[PDB]
Structure 1
Amino acid sequence: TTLDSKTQSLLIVNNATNVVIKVCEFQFCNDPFLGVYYHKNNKSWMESEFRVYSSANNCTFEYVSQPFLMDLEGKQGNFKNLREFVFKNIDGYFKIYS
């Protein structure tokens, strides 16, 4: 609603290993992101920075699925895939269709 830790807030994030869903009183920064960082010793791109929220407290629901490895490297060319989702919020249920 306000996204300033005065009210609850849902947060869905794949951090390249798992998907985490947190409903927790985040105090967000103005420009959240994920920092992928590139290594020169090997041609491997990896996530390094997680600066979405400045805090997390007073919170009830939290889910983390199984781990998975995904190719977050820089792929050059056309978009080789499409992903569509629909989010609804009906009577206390947040429905995600994929």
Structure 2
Amino acid sequence: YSSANNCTFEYVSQPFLMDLEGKQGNFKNLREFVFKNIDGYFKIYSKH
């Protein structure tokens, strides 16, 4: 991004950790997300 002017919400979620390998292989894991917006409030869901 270039910059930001006027941010009405900011945010950091819960801590967690990631592997960050530089190798090659089959996808050992899976990630799912359902982004949605209902009645003016954003929401997200997930599973590993």
Q: CA RMSD in A?
A: 1.7
More displaced stretch, 70-79 vs 86-95: 70-79
Cα gap change, 1:81 to 1:96, in 2 (>3 Å) = same
Query: How far is the alpha carbon of 1:69 from its aligned partner?
Result: 4.2
Moved over 2 A (4+): 65-70
Greater share of residues in strand: 1
**Equivalent in 26, 38, 46 of residue 90 of structure 1:** 38
Q: Scaled by the length of structure 2, what TM-score is found?
A: 0.73
Query: How far is the alpha carbon of 1:90 from its aligned partner?
Result: 0.8
How many residues of Structure 1 are paired with residues of Structure 2 in the alignment?
A: 46
Q: Report the 3-state secondary structure (helix = DSSP H, G, I; strand = E; otherwise coil) of the residue aligned with 1:63.
A: coil
Unaligned runs of 5+ in 1: 1-52
Query: Aligned partners of 1:91, 1:78: CA distance in 2, in Å?
Result: 40
Query: How far is the alpha carbon of 1:85 from its aligned partner?
Result: 0.5
Cα gap change, 1:93 to 1:55, in 2 (>3 Å) = same
Q: Scaled by the length of structure 1, what TM-score is found?
A: 0.41
Cα gap change, 1:66 to 1:85, in 2 (>3 Å) = closer
Query: How far is the alpha carbon of 1:55 from its aligned partner?
Result: 1.0
| Per-residue Cα deviation, 1:16-72 (whole angstroms, up to 9, x for no partner) | xxxxxxxxxxxxxxxxxxxxxxxxxxxxxxxxxxxxx10112111101135544221
Unaligned runs of 5+ in 2: none
